[PDB]
Structure 1
Amino acid sequence: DDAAIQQTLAKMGIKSSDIQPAPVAGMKTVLTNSGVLYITDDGKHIIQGPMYDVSGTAPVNVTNKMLLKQLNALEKEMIVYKAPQEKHVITVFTDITCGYCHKLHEQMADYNALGITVRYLAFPRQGLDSDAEKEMKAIWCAKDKNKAFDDVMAGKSVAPASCDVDIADHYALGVQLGVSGTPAVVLSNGTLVPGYQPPKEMKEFLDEHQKMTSGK
């Protein structure tokens, strides 16, 4: 009962954003501002987690899966720079005021040339309500997100814009995932790898990760 669950969280000052049936009978997976919790249908018991499914081809972290579900929903808000012939797809939490982020963007042609598609989500290191957050809100709301990001990173000024994109979601999700600096990379399998890597190195890293992830 979603209603009972929200009342309990309310009494505790905890706010939820997503509730799903858990793989465990009588329980639900609840994403909150205190992390992913596991709560019984009656809202009377909460288990910290994470929850792992140890009944299948391998140990699956349900908490990580819940967070990846949030990332999936944010695909419509990602700024995508697709490689001509896509070999790898990475999601990068970036900050327009971040030096390494400036560098990463300036080398986008190279990452793309090496078959790496880069998808951006906003992560203002200075937090919400910062100049950085305000600036990225404008970019993400532009008529052409890519051109707007390109313009700003080029030192130009983007036109103020408003839309339903909420940078707080990008920031919050990054925090929940473990982002502690920018740029931060999230691999196609869900793994978080904080830090900047040049095109050639990144390509090598991703080829190896893909091979290691596939046992090859």
Structure 2
Amino acid sequence: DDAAIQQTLAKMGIKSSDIQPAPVAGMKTVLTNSGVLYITDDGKHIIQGPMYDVSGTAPVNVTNKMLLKQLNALEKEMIVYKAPQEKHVITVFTDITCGYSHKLHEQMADYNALGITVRYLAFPRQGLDSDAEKEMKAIWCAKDKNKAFDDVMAGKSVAPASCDVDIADHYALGVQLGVSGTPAVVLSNGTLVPGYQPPKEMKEFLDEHQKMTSGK
């Protein structure tokens, strides 16, 4: 009953973003500004979470899964810098006002040459309505996102816009994911790795991570 669930969140100053049926009967996985909450059908009880599916080899984090669902819907708004021969794919929360994000982009060619595809999402450290947020908003709204981003990091102005992209979505998901500084790397499985890493170290890091992750 999405209805009663919302009245409850309302009577608490909590806004819902995505409500999906939870792995447990009578409960729904709710994404809110207060984190992922598990609420009963009648909206009478709220369990903090996270939720783990322990019916198996190792625990499956239901909250992580839900946040990756949101990540999936944002793929259409990510600025993708693909590697000729894609070995790894990482999602980076970046701020065009962050010196380390500058460096990262300035090395985008090396990251790609090493098989690393970088997918950007905006994350204005100074929050919404900040100069950074207002400039990225223009970048993510341009025709060619890759080109617009390149120009701004180059210093060149970009042809602004009024599109359907809302940085707040990126920002809120980043926060939800544990982001706080930039750049922040998010891995395929949802693992967050704050900080900038030079190409060689990044490649080395991702290779080792994939080995450990797959037991090799």
Bin the TM-score by the shorter chain: over 0.9
Question: Whole-Å Cα distance in 2 between the matches of residues 180 and 143 of structure 1?
Answer: 29
TM-superposed CA distance for 1:57, in Å, is 3.1
DSSP-derived class of the 1:101 partner = helix
2:132 aligned residue: 132
Deviant stretches of 4+, over 3 Å: none
Aligned length: 216
Question: Whole-Å Cα distance in 1 between the matches of residues 84 and 181 of structure 2?
Answer: 29
DSSP-derived class of the 1:12 partner = coil
DSSP-derived class of the 1:134 partner = helix
Question: Whole-Å Cα distance in 2 between the matches of residues 177 and 202 of structure 1?
Answer: 20
Normalised to the residue count of structure 2, the TM-score between the two structures is: 0.99
Question: Whole-Å Cα distance in 2 between the matches of residues 111 and 165 of structure 1?
Answer: 26
* 1:105-157 Cα distance to aligned partner (Å, 9 max, x none): 00000000000000000000010000100000000010100000000001111
Normalised to the residue count of structure 1, the TM-score between the two structures is: 0.99
Which piece of structure 1 moves more, 151-160 or 92-101?
151-160
TM-superposed CA distance for 1:56, in Å, is 2.2
DSSP-derived class of the 1:9 partner = helix
* 1:144-171 Cα distance to aligned partner (Å, 9 max, x none): 0000000000111112211000000000
Question: Whole-Å Cα distance in 2 between the matches of residues 184 and 96 of structure 1?
Answer: 13
Structure 1: tracts of 5 or more residues without a match: none
Question: Whole-Å Cα distance in 2 between the matches of residues 130 and 23 of structure 1?
Answer: 39
2:148 aligned residue: 148
Does 1:120 pair with 2:120?
yes
* 1:39-68 Cα distance to aligned partner (Å, 9 max, x none): 000000110010100002320110111111
DSSP-derived class of the 1:163 partner = coil
* 1:84-103 Cα distance to aligned partner (Å, 9 max, x none): 00000000000000000000
TM-superposed CA distance for 1:188, in Å, is 1.2
Question: Whole-Å Cα distance in 1 between the matches of residues 179 and 8 of structure 2?
Answer: 29
Structure 2: tracts of 5 or more residues without a match: none
Structural RMSD (CA): 0.5
